[PDB]
Amino acid sequence: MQPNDITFFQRFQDDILAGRKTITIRDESESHFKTGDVLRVGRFEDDGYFCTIEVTATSTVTLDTLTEKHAEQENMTLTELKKVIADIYPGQTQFYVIEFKCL
Numbered sequence: 196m197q198p199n200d201i202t203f204f205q206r207f208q209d210d211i212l213a214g215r216k217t218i219t220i221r222d223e224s225e226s227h228f229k230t231g232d233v234l235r236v237g238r239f240e241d242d243g244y245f246c247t248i249e250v251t252a253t254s255t256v257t258l259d260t261l262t263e264k265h266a267e268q269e270n271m272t273l274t275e276l277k278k279v280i281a282d283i284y285p286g287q288t289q290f291y292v293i294e295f296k297c298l
Contacts, residue, residue, distance in 0.1 A: 200234045201234050201293075203237070203238065204239055205239070211236060234295050253291070260292075
């Protein structure tokens with residue numbers, strides 16, 4: 196068996212399945228894989244490590260600073276944002292962002 200690399204809320208996962216490259220956010224203390232590598236994708240709901248993806252680029256920024264939270268912020272309400280945020284992870288402070296694309 197093997198652990199997962201990075202997860203993505205159901206919403207994020209679905210959007211991922213729709214392709215459209217997207218950026219991710221990780222914690223240095225949890226610095227997972229790196230660029231030019233593979234990023235195991237999976238739904239946190241209960242579909243973790245479902246498929247595999249590859250990184251494309253990386254950067255250092257917050258969450259809503261790019262995370263879907265932004266697209267949602269300008270779409271959904273605070274509640275929803277808090278829902279996804281809670282589905283993604285707590286803490287609204289700068290962090291590591293890793294971009295990837297679906298081959």
